[PDB]
């Protein structure tokens, strides 16, 4: 089942970014990846994704939490709360990402998330620090 | 015996058109009674009527245009990957919006859009600018 | 292999028929190109599968095969097809070309005529009024 | 047997785009039915034979065949044919299955889609005009 | 390079064509200067241009219908297998024609055609019945 | 070339009558022949034809003189001059053949001629009979 394998391939991989399973980053993600997060940043490359991820292991952890999931053919869309964690501040914000897949690799991988979500997410994060809550 | 899955993509796909059509008794059939509709992080709404007929009140005064390059379901949930417009008059601010739907027998009980302030905010720059060249204008 | 693209191209389209949409997704190439001449084009197996998928319970389809025949990699089809839409059934002659590879479809080419299927849907709408 | 079938009708739309009319009689089964689906119907390869050859210098054909396969007896093609009427040219698709019996064709079925022999006249005409 | 045969039989079926639609310049293009006209056993005419506008002269006074069975070449020669009719107002008599002709370049030279005049006799009594049971008439 | 086998065939049958040559006539007539004289006679039958033409040697014999044939296909028409020869008296008068011709058999073979040209035929044979030219 081409589309239940696709959704597998999506949650495999937001499960090793957040584990920190950096081989199975690299095995999900192929070499013409595209990775957008929409209105920020492009980059081209598979292997370029990964090798930066992996760089970014011990300065920044991230989690995942995936509420809801679907396909539609090879794409994958995702509605999350995701968590980038530096020391003890956390910045939590909703995600919406959309994945294309072909042959059990992520050939797109494009998060939505809203600055002013994100910035209401830095501001509990930095209170917590204080208020550790 | 067709899958609950098509249905509800049908419906959420129904739906929408019908907003963009102004097909306001399809609208009202669309919605159910205990619907919450969320514009994440600015409105909560509940109640399918309530939302139904503020929806049909807004006719000649905004227009919305929808369009979805990917939608998909988890059971009863359909997700949803858009573009949107809201026109009013010679003014069009046009977004991305990402919206989460859960359809019950046909009816929608949850519709939560998702979008980006900055993406808006940029929307409606290029709306103001196209008010005055009219050659910049966004399109779907 | 020409026995084999011929079975392909059968088990399709009577997973078609049947609404067998594992077997309709299983059956298509990545890089399928999928066309009804003169009308349409759609790129993508992925694409082309989950279209037809959420087709069901609004469009049936029928497909009678009268004559299948291969030269290689290439299969061609003599049918007749039926779209079903309620108690509308709109039935036309199709004549279709494939191309199989690996067992997956890569080529999905159906030709028909808009006279034929405007006689048929006229053939449809009086047997609404006239089951007969 | 298959390939024996498959030359069969290759020299024979090779003979009728080239004028060969010995050759298109030698080819054409005494019971042959002709047709052109939803227009015309032919019994008889003498008389099919001798229409065609009458026709010389009045209009002319060409034929390209894409692919053609065969199922036994049967052969199937995916053409593009041209009727040509002096300065008129008009082209369009077309399908055509046969069915050979010891090297004559007994059945000769072609299908083709009156929009797009409709556009192929409208491309003519304007190239009557604008010859390029 | 077509064949003086297929242009022969072509030449006899447009002129023949021409007779029944009262085209009376191509029957005028399609008759030699010095054509030999018979109707075998009753009638010679020398002249293209005197058959020509006699021919021209019966319109509006007796129609020709011609139903050609079955036609072929030798040569120059051309053969036919036919059912004509003359038709004289509400008056139709119809019969059996064979006629041999010969072109040269495209024009015809001879016009030879054969009939029995019992077979015609039979064709007047049928026009003549039908005259009065206008079930009876003979058709193409 | 099937066109010119079908007027063989035509011309060798005619040239059989002639000739008394009846095995050629039998072989050249196809089982289900019809055999007409327009508006006088039909005959269903290659054999039954066959036998009665065998059964008219020495009692009529024919000539056959074609000026002009030709192909439609299957079909062969010819025009001819013909005459039946009953001792003494010869009646002569034209006759135009239509013929169809399958697998080198004649299965249609239908004759045209007129009564008033026969006639004709037949008042100059009784008179060269007396007046033998
Ligand atoms: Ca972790
Ligand atoms: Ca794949
Ligand atoms: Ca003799
Ligand atoms: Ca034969």
Redesign the interface.
Known sequence: ???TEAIRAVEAFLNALQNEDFDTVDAALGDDLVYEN??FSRIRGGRRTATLLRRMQGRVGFEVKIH????????????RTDALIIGPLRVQF?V?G?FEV??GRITLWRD??????MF?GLLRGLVALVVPS
């Open positions: 089942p081409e589309t929409v209105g809801r999931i679907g396909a539609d053919g090879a794409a994958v869309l995702t509605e909703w919406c959309v072909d042959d939505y998330f809203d600055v002013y979500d209401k």
